[PDB]
Amino acid sequence: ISAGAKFRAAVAAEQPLQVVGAITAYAAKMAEAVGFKAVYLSGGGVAANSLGIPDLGISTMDDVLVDANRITNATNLPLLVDIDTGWGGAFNIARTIRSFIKAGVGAVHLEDQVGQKRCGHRPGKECVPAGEMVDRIKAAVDARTDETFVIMARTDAAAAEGIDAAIERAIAYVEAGADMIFPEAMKTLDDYRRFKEAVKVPILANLTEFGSTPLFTLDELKGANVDIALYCCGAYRAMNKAALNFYETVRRDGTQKAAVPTMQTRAQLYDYLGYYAYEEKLDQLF
Amino acid sequence: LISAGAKFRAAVAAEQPLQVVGAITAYAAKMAEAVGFKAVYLSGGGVAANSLGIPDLGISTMDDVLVDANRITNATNLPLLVDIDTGWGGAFNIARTIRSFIKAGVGAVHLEDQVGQKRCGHRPGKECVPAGEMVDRIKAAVDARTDETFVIMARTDAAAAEGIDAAIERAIAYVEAGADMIFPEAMKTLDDYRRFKEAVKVPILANLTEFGSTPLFTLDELKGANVDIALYCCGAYRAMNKAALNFYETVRRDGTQKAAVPTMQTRAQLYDYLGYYAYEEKLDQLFNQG
Amino acid sequence: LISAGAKFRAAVAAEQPLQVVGAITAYAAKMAEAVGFKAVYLSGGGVAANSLGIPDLGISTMDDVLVDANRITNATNLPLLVDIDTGWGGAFNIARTIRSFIKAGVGAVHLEDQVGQKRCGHRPGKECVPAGEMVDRIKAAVDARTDETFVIMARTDAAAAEGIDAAIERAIAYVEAGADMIFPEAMKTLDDYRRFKEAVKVPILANLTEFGSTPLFTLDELKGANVDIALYCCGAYRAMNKAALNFYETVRRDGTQKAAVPTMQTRAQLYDYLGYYAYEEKLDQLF
Amino acid sequence: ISAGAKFRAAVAAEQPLQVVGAITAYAAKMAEAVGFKAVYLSGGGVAANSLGIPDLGISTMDDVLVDANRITNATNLPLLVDIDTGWGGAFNIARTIRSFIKAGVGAVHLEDQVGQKRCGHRPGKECVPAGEMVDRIKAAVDARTDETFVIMARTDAAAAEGIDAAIERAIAYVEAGADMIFPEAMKTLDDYRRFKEAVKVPILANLTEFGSTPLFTLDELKGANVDIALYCCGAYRAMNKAALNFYETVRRDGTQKAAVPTMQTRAQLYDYLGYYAYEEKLDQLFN
Incomplete structure (x- = not known):
């Protein structure tokens, strides 16, 4: 009974579904004991805690792999994993998808950030044109060997191009085969409502502390039609x-x-x- | 640039007793460094429970400990001490272990006189091997060691079942075999440590573990007992x-x-x-070009 | 959606005896598939000497074998059989091993009834455990197995020191304990194999290794002896x-x-x- | 004595210095027995053999890491490693240099090619602004914690921009701190001669079979003033x-x-x- 299937089942059974970040295998076990139905491995979480370095895209696919493995061996809850831009072109994205399926990871999220850049670059927040992310998703979906495995598209377009641009990219991403959508940094409950109605697939709300986003309550979100509430970092900041x-x-x-x-x-x-x-x-x- | 072993020896010479704190992640180690500690520790049971999500029943392999040890030495430049259990096998394996952890940039390591692989269906639980058998283990480790500044520390649990004198005897044999320092488990009084230091004449470690039998002695109490190292191996991660x-x-x-x-x-x-x-x-x- | 285990069982059913060739690298395995073989093998001593540059003295760890096993099953679609020695420890470790190799997408795994670790300075020799100690090993493995299609194969070196009949008796006890197939080490004659298959009644493997005691029996010879698997474990790497x-x-x-x-x-x-x-x-x- | 120091010693002691590729730890051991003073880890070698996939920049830093570790553990000859473009920006190049230092490698080679690109872009080699490769080298030299570690700059510019442009880049690369230079695809002995005279640092000649480059002899190369003869792939094609x-x-x-x-x-x-x-x-x- 596949990890992907466990994740899809969890979203259908709890609305919105609470999913909490874990930085270690044991953290996850605790999250399970407390009664959550899904856990999350944060990319910046791997980098800061396991490696001792900032979230500047230094983190490699294997870094995230060893953590993802330790976690799915330790809990039987479906795990969602932050895979940045997929760590390269179409062939690398393919290897990524395959690796994380084999690791027993249930859902996975890819984002429309610029990838590798210009040696001396400073590190910022650029997007890629919609057709360039559509390529990424296409590579991912074709590399996927088992349809229950969830490919989720994450977008930070809203910040720089306004919420309508973001919605329009999102529809193109579902077009390209993405199963669920992760819209970064929404300011109001309405932003979410409109987004859900436009893209018509499950949506994730990133409840991050010390950010711009207010810390919305489960009910707030349920009223907004959001499918997934994500507490990505609380645990490790507390620890x-x-x-x-x-x-x-x-x-x-x-x-x-x-x-x-x-x-x-x-x-x-x-x-x-x-x-x-x-x-x-x-x-x-x- | 100075070797990890030399850094650790220097730290014991410089701070008496020397406080050394456990860290279960790279970042934890970074914080320990920022707070001013001179050395950090990787706990074996720490690796197992936290990184792997399994009890300390000797399931942890050399490789499990290796990936954690590497992440840590990459992230701080404080010398790291690592629990390496029984060395994960015979003399050839102990050798590979020693070489691996040297290359990993560790400064010190500790082997224990625990029984290696039991029968398949055996129950979990403590038991020492013959003294003569640990001597062998140490011999293999000292031999495999390529750089003398690297510290090999012998840990004994004998005190608990054979009495303190038997343990002191073992320890002398372990220094003979080449061990640089001794880690005597489960001492109940400050006197136990005093005698032990007196007898073995090499640096001595005190395991300050919470929820154990051992009382939580202060730095002063330990200095007065002539102990060289105060080890806070688990606090950090229990708190977290x-x-x-x-x-x-x-x-x-x-x-x-x-x-x-x-x-x-x-x-x-x-x-x-x-x-x-x-x-x-x-x-x-x-x-930047300006 | 067919698991490595099922692919392997199917390949045994479809080709008799089934030829299964050792590969030391991912590419080797890709060649093996191109040439038309239905299954491949990862040799324990193979890992140790080629990948690590050290003799087959039980220094090789579960992770050493894991990384090679991963590279290979990523690179071919043929089911892979892996030498896992004694399982790298007690019942808990045997369990971790079974689970890890399942996840790695391996089709089949053989364990042997040699002794595990002994005294630190023990010389590298060959010794067997009681038939009972190995029954426990197998029991741990079968229990930890999460997908019955995954094949657990028991290997014995008893024949050499205790005679063929002792080894047969052990093998029946290993099938008892749940072992799906048997790997009898160092048989001298075609008859040895015939009697063995007859008594144990499960699929049997013949280790065709060069420079050993065993003669290099032909596919036909083995067919006539009722052997199910012909294993060419090392030829490839000695050649290369x-x-x-x-x-x-x-x-x-x-x-x-x-x-x-x-x-x-x-x-x-x-x-x-x-x-x-x-x-x-x-x-x-x-x- | 650092492996960097061992490598520099070996170049001073044998001219030109023969260095041969090995795809496994054992291969390296053989190379050492035969009497070579250095060995090589080929990037495409790791990809094809260990991974079972084409040299299309799929290979990660970790892939090369595990092979690099296996080799330096098994031989005490200094090893040279192909590190492509360093697997990312300045912070990744830095992590790369640090990693390969700690793995006991002795010399690394970085090349002035393109990376990465538009998800969909086809294979085909293109160079970067010389300005960019200078930035890469600067990153590397800065992250280097032990001077004896050799950073080697490789360029494929000659093929598309002519030999003069390539020499010009090379001088800028030595400026940026590169210790030695690896000029790809030279057609004649004279191309090498002029290059070494222009850049004034040690030079490597890539003796690759089935390529454009003729298979020049040690003498031919000695006469052309080349410091390093590199037999990067022969071994594994043979095997x-x-x-x-x-x-x-x-x-x-x-x-x-x-x-x-x-x-x-x-x-x-x-x-x-x-x-x-x-x-x-x-x-x-x-005893």
Whole structure:
């Protein structure tokens, strides 16, 4: 029963569907325990946390691969993955799609940002002409070996070209075979409503903190006809503050005593780890 | 440019006892460096639970630890200490292990006297091998070592089942076999450490682990006991896991993360520690023509 | 939508005995398919000596084999059989192994009943576990298997030290434990194979390896013996390794490779088997 | 002693220096046994052999990484690696240089070609503004943490812009910090002679079979003042034919009998692989 199918089922069963970002395998396991139906691997998340570098397109397909693998082996929730521009031309996009299907990843999102650029370039927010993204999607859809796997198109056109330009690109992207649409940086509930009505496929709302977008509630979004609510980064920002706090209190106090009330207990780890199931499996066989 | 091993030896000479903190990600290590620590640690059970999502039952392979170890040494220039369990096999494998982690740019490593591969259906759980068998393990590691500044540290769990004196005996044999430093597990009093340092005469590590049997000794207490290294191996990631769980729960409960944002690290903060503007300042210095 | 496992079982049914050839690299496997074989093999010692440059002394890790296995199943559509030695550890590790190789798109996997790790300074020799320890190994594997089409094959080296009948008895116990097929190491006669197939009643593999004890039996000989799989595990790489040494030698001797160019596959043939022109079509068929 | 230093030493000690490509760790070991002072990792070599796909810039930095690691672990000769255009902008080139330093490689070669392009664009080599390749090199030189590591600039300009334009670019590339230059597709011995005299740094000659370039002798190149003779692909073309031949004889004859005189023996594999040396250490350590 395929990962793609698990993801499509989850969108049909919960409206809007909450999907939370995880930076580690264990994070995902927790997200599962808490009752979510889908998890997300952020591209900038891979780069900052796993690699220790800014989100400047330094991140390679394999970097994202090793994380995506660790995660789908650890949870049985469908995982959605940020694959930037696909890391190259039509043949590379193809390799990408195939690699991430094989990794057991359930849905995937491609974006209409300029790709590789001019050695000395500084790093900005340009789009590609609609026919250039249409090419990308076409390559992706043809490379796809199992139709249940979800190919989602992400667009940041709205910011520079206005929301109508964005809607018109989006329709061309569904034309080219994209299953769902991720419109970046919408300012109002109405923006979403209009978008959903125009493109007529499932839509994702990126609920990002410290951005421009307000942090809309599940109900707000349900009323707006949005299909997917995405909390991409909260988890790791929360965990990174907790970790800095630990380090500071150890360096200041000469002991970590003051920070132990902010820790998870061993029994809670074993519980989430499904640790008791092993001693169990060992019995059942022997 | 100085070797990772030399950096670690220098750090022990320079700070007594030396605080060394565990990090489960590259970024965590970066933060530890920013806060002023001189050395960082990669915990074996840390790799297994966090990176892989599985208990510490020796399922973790050398390669699992390798990818994490590489990501970390690439991201900080503080010397890193790595838990390498039993070395993942016989003398030939211990050799490959040693070579691999040297090349990875690590500065120190620690092998334990735990029993290697049990029977297939065996239960999980602690047990040491004969002393004479760990001596073999160390011998293979010392031999494979290509650069003497690289630190090989021997870890023993013998104290718990054979008493402290037996453990001290083993440790002397382990220094004989070439071990540079000793990591004695599960000491209950400051005296235990004092005696141990006295007997083995090489640098000694204290594992300050929370929710264990070991009390959480202070830097002073340990300095007075003549301990060389204070190791906070797991705190960081336990803290971070709680914060994560809390995020997830408040999102599922409230239909928004609003309530949780005060518990997050800002973006401006992320960029400070991410060295972010130093990148912009390179593209300019390299390609601006004015 | 046919899984690597089902492709392999189908290929056993369709060709008897089935010829299955070893490949050390992705390209090798592409050739093997072009030549018309229905299945390919990734040899454990093959990984170790060629990819890693080290002897077959159990140094090779599960990930070493994984990366090669991945490259190969990405590059051909034939089902692949992989040597996974002892499974790289206890029941939990055997499980991780089975799951990892399933995901890698491998069709079939053989495990052997050798001992795992022993004393640190133990010399490289050959030893068997109790028939019971290997039953546990198989049980772990079968349980971890998520798709029954995936073939779990048990290999035994018992014959050598305990005689043919002990080995037969083990094998029946391994089928008991869930093993789909059996790989009996080092048989001397066509009769050995015949009796073995008769007793174990599941598909049987014959390891046709060069420079060993085993004679190089022909397809017909094996057909008449009731053998299901003929395995040529290493020929390919020994052939290519000599070719390579020869090239290095002639270059160091002559100060040019001119003498060696007749042994080389042409830039042009390479390009064809990699199916380079099929990419042009795609670009055209897309844009 | 760094692998950068080993490589620079080797160029000073043997002129011109012969350097041969290896597609596997074992191949490299053989190359060393035969007496070569350096080996080469071909970009197209990684793509075709390890991956099973054409040299159309599909190959990633990691693909080349895993092969590069396997090789430098298995031989102690300095290795030279084809790194194409560096796999992205200035920050990617930087990551690339750092990665290949830490992998123990000794010299890298960057080339002034185009990358990447419009999703749909067909294969066909085109160069960039010289201004752009200078930026690439600057990025590399800056990211380099150990001077002894050799950064080599490769250009394909001669083919479309004439030999003079190429010499001009080359001088600008040495300006930008490039240590040595690799001028693609020279037709005559004189082309090389003029180039070395113009750029005044060490020069590489790509001795490629089935190409345009004649297969020049060590002497011919010595007389032309060339520093490095590069046999990048011979080895694996030779080994690929031997392998196809194996597969064909097996499918034809129903046995490999006819092929075994092509094969490198078991006894020979063990030599080349250090083998006994493992046993000798167990004695060293535990007797």
